[PDB]
Structure prediction request, 351 residues.
Amino acid sequence: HMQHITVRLPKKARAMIVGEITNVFKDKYPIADKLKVIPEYDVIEQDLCKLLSPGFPKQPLRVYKFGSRITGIGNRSSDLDLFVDIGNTFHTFEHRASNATVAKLRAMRKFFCDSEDWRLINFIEQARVPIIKTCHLPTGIECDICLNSMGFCNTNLLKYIFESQPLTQYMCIYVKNWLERCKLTEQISTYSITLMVIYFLQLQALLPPIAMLQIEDAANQAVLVGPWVVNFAQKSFSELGLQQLKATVPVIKGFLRNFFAYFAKFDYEHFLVCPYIGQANVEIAKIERMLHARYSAYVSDNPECSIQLKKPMVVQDPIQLNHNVTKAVTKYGLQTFVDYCQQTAELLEEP
RNA sequence: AGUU
Prediction:
């Protein structure tokens, strides 16, 4: 009994949806806002610089913090993501880590192992973005350490979006928690659903297309990481012509109802979630011809690194345009997601 | 498949 039967929304999610929206945020939003900046992070950054510099003498070293804590959707149990730039690699793109990058990460491992200030949790060199997971013992904060600047770049984009249009931030906190209660996080990450929220609000004219923030003319040049444009015009929404909403409980509830209803009925077979273009009905069959000329040139030289479109669910990263962030979602995982969306939208209704 |  599979495709003809709806996957039942888990009880742990149902209780939270049917419970008042207020109790969702009463603690979670103020906590998430406070975790954007705490002094603990300066201790981590300084300790990490002190730890690793002797391992890379005569090379510049800068640490960049990113991820959910930094954008404003974290909680006390969230990891802190850290990009360690040794030797000015910020503007270098590696879809999969180079051997040189792996050798650098390998060399970093023994420092965390040897240092009493850090507990090594895992060393993941075979991931697309290899990482060292380690606990910073003085603060107790778990850190994911990588050698790839792109997550930092999209964090700064999210931070601008969230600060300009706080509704986005409230919605992301809600759907992050919904994913956890639905036990969907193995298939759909917090970052993936953040891009889905962004795209949904773009369709409502509440957020700009990312492409529109990256016009290349006399006033505005690109910051490039490989072929990707990672900066954006930090224009006020007043200049952009976009209204800025106060997120209230009824406002949030109404947008979340429409969010879940929209992704319950989205045609994942023919369309992709596309915060770069930020318009309705962006066709899987067309997207590769809609990107900037650097994309086509990049795939010409990296033919196995074009966006993976032959997948049940396509959500394109707005900066790293060759990345379908949901490429690992299975047909049954997508069916589960859409069913959960459908049931959540129903429970958020008030006829 | 593992950060975002």
Q: What stands out?
A: Chain A has one domain: 1-351.
